[PDB]
Structure formats: structure tokens, C-alpha cells
Design a binder for this molecule. Structure first.
Ligand code: CHL
Ligand code: CLA
Ligand code: CLA
Ligand code: CLA
Ligand code: CLA
Ligand code: CLA
Ligand code: CLA
Ligand SMILES: CC(/C=C/C=C(C)/C=C/[C@@]12O[C@]1(C)C[C@@H](O)CC2(C)C)=C\C=C\C=C(C)\C=C\C=C(C)\C=C\[C@@]12O[C@]1(C)C[C@@H](O)CC2(C)C
Ligand SMILES: CC1=C(/C=C/C(C)=C/C=C/C(C)=C/C=C/C=C(C)/C=C/C=C(C)/C=C/C2=C(C)CCCC2(C)C)C(C)(C)CCC1
Ligand SMILES: CC1=C(/C=C/C(C)=C/C=C/C(C)=C/C=C/C=C(C)/C=C/C=C(C)/C=C/C2=C(C)CCCC2(C)C)C(C)(C)CCC1
Ligand SMILES: CC1=C(/C=C/C(C)=C/C=C/C(C)=C/C=C/C=C(C)/C=C/C=C(C)/C=C/C2=C(C)CCCC2(C)C)C(C)(C)CCC1
Lengths: 202, 159, 98, 41, 192, 62, 80
């Protein structure tokens, strides 16, 4: 398989069969069993949340540049916008909501039985995933039954994080750019395409 | 504001602490020609003084009843640039140093003559460890959680 | 006006009631639990002290519950203390609230 | 040449090289970023 | 089971009524400590269950505030009551006297019991309806515990609200909630 | 006592090497020796010596 | 007048008696270590407190211990 640098010298704690593996652990970060079985899930949730953030950042500024809506900028949407409720109330409500889901995910990470629902739904309300790691299922998470077979989801499970890493670096780019240019990201890109050899890092 | 100190860009005692120093520098300057090394050095010093005094007022430090900045090492959000912001980077650097030193000791200790590798450093291994010592918190906390950080059979004795 | 002869007698009577009636088994069991001061394993009197001897000629009583004179002294002292603590307070009038 | 590298791997020589590099770094920083009392971040 | 799937300690095997396995700090590790803790929890639960109506009723009927209903001290007079008629024998010293004496006698009576079962479940003249004779009993204990813990939490909420919002009671706070649920909430004292 | 080349940990309360490990050299098997076990350590003491003899009941952890 | 003591850990190095510059320590037959030798301090009335004895015994802590006691003319090392 290909590695990050062609002078490979690949590490031992990660050998193969892992989705999106390129032997990139130069700083020996996860070398212990718990460390790897935890960092896989960490990278998964990070990739997914950053993909969601990218999908919520691009579309808005793109359509606003091409003239479709009058929504505010990403670094201005949450920034002092009285829209429906008090922002702090929404923050507290979001924390109380995310608690009941992050606790379930934690439970399944540490002791992988959490599929059955509650409130007298002990019957036909089981989550039918049964995966190796934190990949849920059931109509509540995987309605269309796309994750069909094991030992050949590696293309799709690879695509997931190969897009999530790009989304993560894209999000960091969004933050740093909109912090140092004080301008929209697609506005930055257009002003760059105006004359590339003059619009660079200061 | 806090602690009965006024901001420095309004302190009527900072103006004197600036103009007196400026006038002293000019009195020194008037002993040469405007095209000689002492005059150039003194003009550079004056420009540096102006650039220094036109930065404290813009930052937001609070001056005293004598026209001197005072650091509010309290946790005040309006003053994080005085203690906690530099303190965090210092703690980062110091943890880096300590972690890479500890790791070098741990690695050297399992060798043939470990005492030889402490008066004669082996630069390849030391450099490797210094490089890997960038993510030291994610490693120190991981060694704490995994029970690899401390010993239990210490060799202290007292009769 | 704060009358005294009734308030301090009510305080003393209340604390004497408390001592003789409601706290007497508790007090007796707690005294018997930690009985005698002991040095090096044996009490002061047996370690040798003509002045560490209890006075039973002062403790011989007849109350059905064993209410000796020192119990009366202690509970009445507490009664007078609470009575005067009440007396001294209700003579000023103040407003030290929230 | 090997013994030369071993000698350069001694404690005083590495100490003085490290401290001189650090002194140069700090001196350059202070010549370019002078009179730093508050972190502007 | 306060955490579906999580195991239980060696002392929280679920035999006791109202037992779910909650002990993250490891307090009940010692047997006699746990035996005292159970009785203490039952006492606190019963006191809070008694207290909750005692605060919720007189604000809507006797028109008090449960913190001004105790304010009538430091000012001669007060001593309001249910209809509002002043209780003539409600002078602070002579009322604190009996408030002390009666409760002292009651507690010094309850304290004298060797049996832990009879300690936290006396019966006799305290069950003068045959509610626990031979019928469903563990279920009754479970209902009692489940209501008592809820009452404890409710009273803690009472005491924190009366401090966050001074000079008011926990019933006008419901009207404040239902005046604007999305602006009037805990996110004001937490995030000022 | 213990085997040769065995790694044992000391229990002598007044030893420099208390709670430290060392490999046995050769335990003398005479009838009347009071401290037959001989162990050498990889760290000298304040006097500079690294070998010392103990009794078999005075050091064992394996 | 100082008090010398020889605990039963002497391996018979004989260095204690070689070092003592007062003829205080002497060897004695005592089976048990390797060579049936042990130290002995019969002439403690002459020890000055030199502690050269303790600086020689290569035992774990020590096997010969000097305790400084009452001072006299011999122990003070005086020549006047
Ligand atoms: C990060 C972040 C996450 C994971 C969420 C997620 C959520 N938001 Mg939220 N939000 C987040 C930042 C922000 N939100 C909002 C504005 C809103 C609004 C107006 C609403 C939410 C709602 C919700 C909830 C939808 C169910 C859920 C807890 C909804 C909700 O809370 O319904 C109960 C809702 O109505 N968010 C702004 C502005 C944010 C950033 O500044
Ligand atoms: C983690 C994901 C995430 C988060 C936190 C947000 C957060 C937000 N979005 Mg958003 N969005 C997302 C993903 C996300 N978006 C995606 C994937 C799409 C597609 C959109 C499309 C979208 C639109 C079209 C609008 C928002 C708006 C908003 C703001 C108010 C939300 C309410 O209503 C808030 C800052 C609204 C807003 O305030 O304007 C920017 C709004 O009009 N979003
Ligand atoms: C994810 C990939 C990605 C892509 C396609 C871009 C693309 C771009 N970045 Mg960028 N950036 C990224 C990640 C990315 N960035 C990350 C991860 C960071 C954090 C270090 C930054 C920090 C950054 C800065 C600080 C600046 C850019 C700027 C720019 C623009 C000019 C090209 C340049 O200077 O570089 C261009 C649109 C520059 C600009 O002004 O945009 C016009 C600019 O000043 N970027
Ligand atoms: C723990 C002690 C301590 C601490 C916290 C500091 C902290 C600081 N010193 Mg300082 N200093 C110290 C001991 C210390 N020094 C000692 C012992 C000496 C004597 C050798 C000096 C001599 C010294 C000089 C000559 C200068 C500083 C400067 C500075 C500032 C660093 C600005 C920079 O380079 O970025 C900073 C406030 C520089 C500065 O600009 O101060 C504001 C500067 O010019 N210090
Ligand atoms: C938990 C025990 C408890 C305690 C300590 C109190 C204590 C008190 N209650 Mg109360 N109460 C309780 C339970 C309790 N209540 C319950 C369970 C109910 C529901 C039936 C009530 C209903 C109630 C009303 C309706 C009123 C009080 C009032 C009072 C106060 C006046 C006492 C008085 O003169 O009456 C005791 C005198 C003779 C028995 C006093 C602070 C009065 C008050 O504060 O007015 C503002 C008042 O009006 N209580
Ligand atoms: C939700 C309210 C609630 C419930 C369901 C129970 C339930 C119970 N209590 Mg109970 N109790 C409560 C509130 C409650 N208590 C309060 C507020 C006080 C004060 C007491 C004081 C009390 C005593 C003193 C005794 C009970 C006893 C009992 C048991 C049998 C009597 C019965 O069911 O009635 C049963 C487990 C009896 C028992 O367990 O025996 C008993 O002796 N309770
Ligand atoms: C027992 C359950 C319970 C219930 C039903 C309530 C209900 C309420 N609380 Mg509350 N509270 C509780 C327990 C409870 N509390 C506990 C245990 C605490 C201590 C942590 C608090 C601390 C608390 C604060 C600090 C505040 C509330 C507030 C409120 C009100 C705002 C509505 C809301 O989102 O909540 C509402 C009437 C808020 C309020 O009164 O605003 C209207 C408010 O500021 N509560
Ligand atoms: C998840 C993430 C970003 C998520 C962003 C989100 C949700 C954005 C949300 C919002 O926009 C919306 C939705 C709407 C706005 O109104 C509100 C906000 C809130 C603004 C970034 C991850 C960002 C993660 C990043 C950048 C990670 C970079 C890692 C790199 C480069 C390498 C790391 C290493 O681990 C390796 C690989 C090997 C080791 O040996 C060496 C090291 C270095 C340790
Ligand atoms: C916040 C704040 C504050 C406070 C502070 C405090 C109060 C602190 C505390 C602290 C503490 C109380 C501490 C603790 C301690 C610790 C411990 C107990 C541990 C130890 C440590 C360790 C172990 C480490 C390790 C290491 C590393 C990591 C690196 C290298 C080196 C070493 C190895 C050493 C102030 C006001 C000032 C200011 C503002 C902010
Ligand atoms: C015989 C009898 C009887 C009777 C009894 C009696 C009658 C009793 C009484 C009692 C009493 C009558 C008591 C009293 C006591 C008292 C006391 C004991 C006192 C003390 C006091 C004090 C100690 C004080 C102090 C002080 C001072 C001095 C000053 C100021 C401060 C004070 C206050 C602190 C009866 C009927 C029951 C029964 C039968 C038998
Ligand atoms: C940007 C810029 C600048 C700046 C610079 C920089 C970038 C630097 C930073 C850095 C810094 C600015 C740092 C420093 C700071 C520090 C501080 C200010 C600290 C102090 C404090 C302390 C140190 C204290 C002490 C203590 C005590 C008292 C006790 C014990 C502990 C301790 C030791 C901590 C300038 C002006 C040039 C110009 C313009 C641009």
C-alpha cells in the first residue's frame, strides 16, 4: 500500500485493514491499544462534525456571492444575531440535548451494548448495526441500508474519512482566513483568482 | 478602573514620564552634528522610545498614581495579555523541555553504559525525542491514564 | 417590660426537664463509655493521687433515675445561661435582617 | 572523524552550542520585537 | 440502573428498595456507613416530602413567600397564619422554645432503636391503617423512595431559585417561565 | 538460598540498596554462615562499593 | 573512653585493624563468615575517635561502629 512518505519505515501499532490507513504516526501519538481504539472514534466524529461544518459554511457564502439569499456570513451568523431565542438559552438547551446522545455513544464505546431503546420500546425498537467500532445503524441512523457488507465497505469507509480530513483542514482554513482577512472565504478565493501572484499571506 | 488605576492612554503622569525622557535624550543629542554616528544612534533611541510609549496606551494597561504600568494578574478577561496568555505558552515550553528530558532519560537507562550516555549525548536519539516532544500534553495525560507515569517500589530507607 | 423571675425560672425548668427526662440515658451511656481519665493504661487515682478520687459522699443520691447533685448543678447552670442570654436580648430592639 | 563527532557530543560543547543558539534567537527577537510587556494576542 | 449496561459495586447489588447502583464517589464502601446512610436518606426524603406542600400551598392560599413568611422577625409583630389571623402565642422566644423541646423529645425517642428495619420502617402506631401488613410492600418502598428523591431535588431547586431570584418564590418563577420560555431560563444566572 | 544469576530485591532496612534489585553472584553453602548470599548491584553507595552479602531471609522478591 | 562495637557482619577484611593508628582493634577467631575471623576492640581506652576504622569496612552500612563518649587525656590526643 502507499504511505505518506515513500521512504516508508512504517510503524507497528498500525499495520493494515484500518479504514483510511497510510502509516502516518510519526509522533508515536497512539501506540497503546486503548489509544488507537479511542483515536479511531475521535477521528471519526471529528471528520463528521467538520464535514457538517463545511457543508454549512460553503453553501451559504457561495449562494450569497451568486445572489440567492441574504443570510449573514459564517463568522457573523452566530455573532450577535437575535433570531428566535436568547443565544445562551439555546446553548444550554443544546448542551442538555447533546448530553443524552454523547453519553449513549460513550456507553457503546466502552461497553458495546446500547442498541435497545427505552420507554416500553423494548420490542421492535432495536438498533440493527452490530459493527466493529462506532458505526451505528437502523432507520434512525442508516435508513437506506447502504452499509451492506463487511470486508468490502473499505471503499466507502475510506471515502468517509478521506473527505473528513479535507473538511477539517478546510475548516481550520476558514477560521484562520476569516480571522486574518476579516472577509468571507469565497470572497477571499475570488480576490485570489483576480491576481494570484499578489494575493498571498500578507 | 479595577484597583483604582486609570488606563495609561489617559494618565496625566505618563505624559511627563515620556516628555522628560525625550527632553533628556534631546539634551544628549545637541552635543553633536546631525550627520554623525552619535546623532543617528540617539535619534534611533528617541524613535524607539516613542514606539514603546505608543504601544502601552493602545494595549490597555492601567497606569498608577506615579505614571507607571501595573499588571492585573487576576484572571480579568480585559487583561489576559498580561499573565495567563504568556503563562500558557511558557507552561507549554517548560512541559516540552521536561517531557523530552524525561523521555531521553527513560530511553538511555536501558542501554549498556547508561552513565556514559549522560556525559556524551547521542545527538540522533536526542534529536528524535526533541522532535517528538511537540505533543507532550497528549502524551503525559496518556501515560497518566495508562498507569505508566509513576513507580511504586521506590528505594527510600530510614531506620 | 422584660420580667425576669419568670423567664429565667422557665429556662431553668426547661433545661432541667431536658436533663432529667429526655437526655438522661444518652448522658449516662456517654459517660460510662469514656469512664475515667487514664494515664499509661490506668486511671489517675490508681496511678497514685490522693486528689484524683471521686466523691461518692457527694454523689450518693436517691432520685429513681440517679440524678445526683452535680447533674442538677450542670443543667441549672445551662438553664441560667440560656435564661440570661434570652433576657439580655429582648431589652434592646433591633432590625438585623437581610 | 568519528572521534571528532564523539568529542562534539560532549556535555560542555553541546551546552555552549545550545545556549549560544538560544541567546542568538532571543537577541534577534528582542531586536525585532522590543519592549514587550503585554502579549498583544 | 442509572447507566444502562454499567456494572454495580460489591455493595450495591440492588437488594435494597429504590436501589439502582449510583455510587461514583464510592461512599458506601464501608458497611456501617451505608447502613447509616440509608436511614439518613430516608429521613431527608420524608422531611422534603413534608416540606414541598408546606411551601407550595401557603403562597397560593395564605399568600406568603416562604422566605418572607419567616421575615416577620427582627420587627415586633407578624406571626401570620392560614387565614392571616395573627397567632397570639407566636412570640419568637416562646415559640422557638417549644419548637426546640418537642423536636428534641421526638428525636431522642426515635434515636433509641437497635433494629435498623424498625429504625427506618417503624410501623406500629406509625402505620395505623395496615398499609404494610402483608400486601405489596417492596413496591410501596420503591414508590416512597422515588417520590422522596424527587422531593429532595425539588427542594434543592427551591433553595437555589430563591437565591438566584431574591425576594420571590418558586411559583412566580413558573409564570416567568410561561411568559417567555425562550428568554427566561437558567441561562441568565449561569451565563450573565 | 536463591539461585545464581537470580534478580532479587533487598529488604534490609539499613541498606543503601533497600527496595532495589540485584543479581546474585554465588551463595556460600557452608553450615554456619550467617549471611551467605552475595549480590552485586549496578549503583555504588556513598562508600563506592557495589557488592554485598545478605542472609536468605533478608531479601527476596524475584 | 569511646565505645567501639563490632556487629556480626564482619567478613574478616582485616582492614579495620590495619587502619586504626592506636593498636585498638585486633583479629580474633570466630567461625561464621568465611575464614573464622572477626574484629575485636579490647583496647577501647586508647581510641581517639579517628573513625579510620569505619572508613574502611566495606560492609552494607557498617560492621564496626565508634560512639564518642567521655573525654580523657588519651582520647583527646594531647601531648602536653
Ligand atoms: C455547535 C452547534 C450544535 C451541535 C447545534 C445543534 C443544535 N441546535 Mg443550534 N447548534 C450549534 C450552534 C448554534 N445553533 C444556533 C442556533 C439555533 C436555533 C434557533 C436552534 C438551534 C437548535 C439546535 C438543536 C437542534 C435539535 C441542536 C441541539 C434548535 C433547538 O434548540 O430546538 C430545541 C433551534 O431552534 N440552534 C446558533 C446561532 C449557533 C452558533 O452560534
Ligand atoms: C453543525 C452543523 C451546523 C450548524 C451548527 C449550523 C448553524 C447555523 N446555521 Mg446552518 N447549515 C448547515 C449546518 C449547520 N448550521 C448545513 C449543512 C446547511 C446546508 C445549512 C444551511 C443553513 C441555512 C440556509 C441557514 C443556516 C442558518 C444557521 C444559523 C441559525 C440556525 C437556526 O435556524 C446557525 C449559525 C441560518 C442563518 O442564520 O443564516 C446563516 C440560515 O438561514 N444554515
Ligand atoms: C484546505 C485547503 C485550503 C485551501 C484550498 C486554501 C486556499 C486559500 N487560502 Mg488558506 N488556509 C488553510 C487551508 C486552505 N486554504 C489552512 C488550513 C490555513 C491555516 C494555516 C490557512 C490559512 C490561510 C491564510 C492565513 C491565508 C490563506 C489564504 C488563502 C487563499 C490564497 C492562497 C494562499 O495564500 O494559500 C486561497 C483561497 C490567504 C488569503 O488572503 O486568501 C485570499 C491568506 O492570507 N489561507
Ligand atoms: C523570572 C524573572 C523574569 C521575568 C519574568 C522576566 C520577564 C521579562 N523580561 Mg527580564 N530579566 C530578568 C528576569 C526576568 N525577566 C533578569 C534576572 C534580568 C537580568 C539579566 C533581566 C533583564 C531583562 C532585560 C534587559 C530586558 C528584559 C525583558 C523582559 C520582558 C521580555 C520581553 C521579550 O523579550 O519578549 C519580560 C517582561 C526585556 C523587555 O523588553 O522588558 C519589557 C528587556 O529588554 N529583562
Ligand atoms: C414541613 C413542615 C412545616 C413547617 C415547619 C411549617 C411551618 C410554617 N407554616 Mg406550614 N404547612 C406545612 C408544613 C410545614 N409548615 C404543610 C405540609 C402544609 C400544607 C397543609 C402547610 C400549610 C401552611 C399554610 C397554609 C400556612 C402555613 C404557615 C406556616 C408558618 C406559620 C406556622 C404557624 O403558626 O402554624 C402552626 C400553628 C399551629 C399548628 C410556619 C413557618 C402559615 C404562614 O407562613 O403564613 C404566611 C400559613 O398561612 N403552612
Ligand atoms: C410518596 C409518599 C410516601 C409513600 C408512598 C410512603 C410509603 C410507605 N411508608 Mg411513608 N412517609 C412519608 C411518605 C410516604 N411513605 C412521609 C412524608 C412521612 C413523614 C412518612 C412516614 C412514615 C412512617 C413513620 C412509616 C411509613 C411507612 C411506610 C410504608 C407503609 C405505609 C404506607 O404505604 O403508607 C410504605 C413503604 C411505615 C413503614 O414502612 O412501616 C412507617 O412506619 N412512612
Ligand atoms: C425538580 C425539577 C425542576 C423543575 C421542574 C424546575 C423548573 C424550573 N426552574 Mg429549576 N432547578 C432545579 C430543579 C427544577 N427546576 C434544581 C435542582 C436546581 C438547582 C441546580 C434548579 C436551579 C434553577 C435556577 C438557577 C433557575 C431555575 C429556573 C427554573 C424555571 C425555568 C424553566 C426551566 O428551564 O427550568 C422552571 C420553573 C430558572 C428560573 O426561575 O427562571 C424563570 C432559574 O434561573 N432552576
Ligand atoms: C472538527 C473541526 C471543525 C468543526 C467545525 C464546525 C463544527 C463548525 C461549526 C460552525 O460553522 C458552523 C457549522 C456554523 C457557524 O455559524 C457556527 C460554527 C460553529 C462556526 C475541525 C477539526 C480540525 C482538525 C484538524 C485541523 C487536525 C489537524 C491534524 C493534523 C494536521 C495532524 C495531526 C496529527 O495527528 C496526526 C495526523 C499524526 C500525529 O503524529 C501528528 C499530529 C499533528 C498530532
Ligand atoms: C487558574 C488561575 C489561577 C489559579 C491557579 C491555581 C490555584 C493553580 C493550582 C494548581 C494546583 C493545585 C496544582 C496541582 C499540582 C499538580 C500535581 C499534583 C501534579 C504534578 C504534575 C506533574 C506530575 C507533572 C508532570 C510533568 C510534566 C507534565 C511535564 C514534564 C515535567 C513533569 C514530568 C514534572 C490564578 C489565580 C493564579 C490566575 C488565574 C487563573
Ligand atoms: C426534690 C424534688 C423535686 C424538686 C426539685 C427542685 C425544686 C429542683 C430545683 C432546681 C433548681 C431551682 C435548680 C437551680 C439551679 C441553679 C444553678 C445551678 C445556677 C447556676 C447559675 C450559673 C452558673 C450562672 C452563671 C452566670 C453568672 C454567675 C454571671 C452571669 C453569667 C452566667 C449567667 C453564666 C421534684 C418536685 C422535681 C420531684 C420530687 C423531688
Ligand atoms: C506584537 C508586537 C510587539 C510585541 C511583542 C511580542 C510578540 C512579545 C510577547 C511576549 C510578551 C509580552 C511576554 C512577556 C510577558 C510576561 C509577563 C508580563 C509576565 C510577568 C509576570 C510574572 C512572571 C509574574 C511573576 C511571578 C510571581 C510574581 C509569583 C511567582 C510566579 C511568577 C514567577 C509567575 C511589540 C510590542 C514589540 C511591537 C508591536 C508588535
Amino acid at each position: 500500500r502507499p504511505l505518506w512518505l515513500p521512504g516508508t519505515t512504517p510503524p507497528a501499532h498500525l499495520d493494515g485493514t484500518l479504514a483510511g490507513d497510510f502509516g502516518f504516526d510519526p509522533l508515536g501519538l497512539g501506540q497503546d491499544p486503548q489509544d488507537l481504539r479511542w483515536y479511531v472514534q475521535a477521528e471519526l466524529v471529528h471528520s463528521r462534525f467538520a464535514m457538517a461544518g463545511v457543508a454549512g459554511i460553503l453553501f451559504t457564502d457561495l449562494l450569497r456571492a451568486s445572489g440567492r439569499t441574504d443570510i449573514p456570513v459564517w463568522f457573523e451568523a452566530g455573532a450577535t444575531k437575535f433570531d428566535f431565542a436568547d443565544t445562551t438559552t439555546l446553548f444550554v438547551v443544546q448542551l442538555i440535548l447533546m448530553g443524552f446522545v454523547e453519553t449513549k455513544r460513550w456507553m457503546d464505546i466502552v461497553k458495546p451494548g446500547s442498541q435497545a431503546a427505552e420507554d416500553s420500546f423494548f420490542g421492535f425498537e432495536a438498533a440493527f448495526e452490530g459493527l466493529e467500532t462506532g458505526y451505528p445503524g437502523g432507520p434512525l441512523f442508516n435508513p437506506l441500508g447502504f452499509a451492506n457488507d463487511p470486508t468490502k465497505p473499505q471503499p466507502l469507509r475510506w471515502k468517509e474519512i478521506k473527505n473528513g480530513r479535507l473538511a477539517m483542514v478546510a475548516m481550520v482554513g476558514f477560521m484562520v482566513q476569516a480571522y486574518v482577512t476579516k472577509t468571507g472565504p469565497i470572497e477571499n478565493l475570488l480576490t485570489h483568482l483576480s491576481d494570484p501572484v499578489h494575493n498571498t499571506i500578507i | 478602573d479595577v484597583a483604582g488605576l486609570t488606563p495609561c492612554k489617559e494618565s496625566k503622569g505618563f505624559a511627563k514620564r515620556e516628555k522628560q525622557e525625550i527632553k533628556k535624550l534631546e539634551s544628549r543629542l545637541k552635543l553633536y552634528a546631525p550627520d554623525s554616528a552619535p546623532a543617528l544612534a540617539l535619534n534611533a533611541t528617541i524613535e524607539k522610545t516613542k514606539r514603546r510609549f505608543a504601544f502601552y496606551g493602545n494595549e490597555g494597561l492601567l497606569c498608577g498614581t506615579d505614571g507607571l504600568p501595573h499588571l492585573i494578574v487576576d484572571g480579568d478577561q480585559a487583561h489576559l495579555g498580561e499573565f495567563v496568555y504568556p503563562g500558557l505558552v511558557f507552561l507549554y515550553i517548560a512541559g516540552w523541555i521536561g517531557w523530552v528530558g524525561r523521555a531521553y532519560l527513560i530511553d538511555v537507562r536501558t542501554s549498556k553504559k547508561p552513565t556514559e550516555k549522560e556525559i556524551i549525548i547521542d545527538v540522533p536519539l536526542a534529536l528524535r525525542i526533541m522532535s517528538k516532544g511537540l505533543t507532550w500534553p497528549v502524551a503525559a495525560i496518556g501515560e497518566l491514564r495508562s498507569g505508566k507515569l509513576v513507580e511504586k517500589s521506590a528505594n527510600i530507607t530510614v531506620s | 417590660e422584660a420580667n425576669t423571675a419568670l423567664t429565667i425560672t422557665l429556662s431553668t425548668g426547661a433545661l432541667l426537664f431536658l436533663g432529667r427526662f429526655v437526655f438522661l440515658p444518652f448522658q449516662r451511656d456517654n459517660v460510662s463509655r469514656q469512664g475515667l481519665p487514664v494515664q499509661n493504661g490506668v486511671t489517675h487515682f490508681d496511678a497514685g493521687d490522693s486528689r484524683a478520687q471521686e466523691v461518692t459522699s457527694f454523689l450518693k443520691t436517691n432520685d429513681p433515675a440517679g440524678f445526683t447533685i452535680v447533674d442538677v448543678l450542670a443543667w441549672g447552670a445551662l438553664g441560667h445561661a440560656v435564661g440570661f442570654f434570652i433576657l439580655a436580648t429582648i431589652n434592646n430592639g433591633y432590625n438585623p435582617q437581610f | 572523524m568519528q572521534d571528532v563527532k564523539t568529542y562534539l557530543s560532549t556535555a560542555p560543547v553541546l551546552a555552549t552550542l545550545w545556549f549560544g543558539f538560544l541567546a542568538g534567537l532571543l537577541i534577534e527577537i528582542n531586536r525585532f520585537f522590543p519592549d514587550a510587556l503585554v502579549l498583544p494576542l | 440502573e442509572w447507566l444502562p449496561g454499567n456494572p454495580r459495586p460489591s455493595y450495591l447489588d440492588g437488594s435494597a428498595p429504590g436501589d439502582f447502583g449510583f455510587d461514583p464517589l464510592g461512599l458506601g464502601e464501608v458497611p456501617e456507613n451505608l447502613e447509616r446512610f440509608k436511614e439518613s436518606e430516608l429521613i431527608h426524603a420524608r422531611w422534603a416530602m413534608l416540606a414541598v406542600p408546606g411551601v407550595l400551598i401557603p403562597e397560593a392560599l395564605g399568600y406568603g413567600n416562604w422566605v418572607s413568611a419567616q421575615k416577620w422577625a427582627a420587627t415586633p409583630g407578624g406571626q401570620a397564619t392560614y387565614l392571616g389571623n395573627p397567632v397570639p402565642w407566636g412570640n419568637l422566644p416562646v415559640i422557638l422554645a417549644i419548637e426546640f423541646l418537642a423536636i428534641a423529645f421526638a428525636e431522642s425517642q426515635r434515636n433509641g432503636e437497635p433494629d435498623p428495619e424498625k429504625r427506618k420502617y417503624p410501623g406500629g402506631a406509625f402505620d395505623p391503617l395496615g398499609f404494610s401488613k402483608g400486601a405489596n410492600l417492596e413496591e410501596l418502598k420503591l414508590k416512597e423512595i422515588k417520590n422522596g428523591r424527587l422531593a429532595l431535588v425539588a427542594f434543592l431547586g427551591f433553595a437555589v431559585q430563591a437565591i438566584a431570584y431574591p425576594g420571590t418564590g418558586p411559583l412566580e418563577n413558573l409564570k416567568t417561565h410561561l411568559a417567555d420560555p425562550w428568554h427566561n431560563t437558567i441561562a441568565h444566572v449561569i451565563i450573565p | 538460598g536463591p539461585k545464581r544469576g537470580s534478580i532479587v530485591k533487598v529488604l534490609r532496612r539499613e541498606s543503601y540498596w533497600f527496595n532495589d534489585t540485584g543479581k546474585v553472584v554465588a551463595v556460600d553453602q557452608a553450615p554456619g554462615v550467617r549471611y551467605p548470599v552475595v549480590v552485586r548491584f549496578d549503583k555504588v553507595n556513598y562508600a563506592g562499593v557495589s557488592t554485598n552479602n545478605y542472609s536468605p531471609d533478608e531479601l527476596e522478591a524475584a | 573512653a569511646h565505645s567501639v562495637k563490632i556487629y556480626d557482619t564482619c567478613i574478616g577484611c582485616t582492614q579495620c585493624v590495619r587502619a586504626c593508628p592506636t593498636d585498638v582493634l585486633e583479629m580474633v577467631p570466630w567461625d561464621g563468615c568465611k575464614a573464622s575471623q572477626i574484629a575485636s576492640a579490647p583496647r577501647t581506652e586508647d581510641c581517639v575517635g579517628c573513625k579510620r576504622c569505619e572508613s574502611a569496612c566495606p560492609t552494607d552500612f557498617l560492621s564496626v561502629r565508634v560512639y564518642l563518649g567521655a573525654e580523657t587525656t588519651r582520647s583527646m590526643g594531647l601531648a602536653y
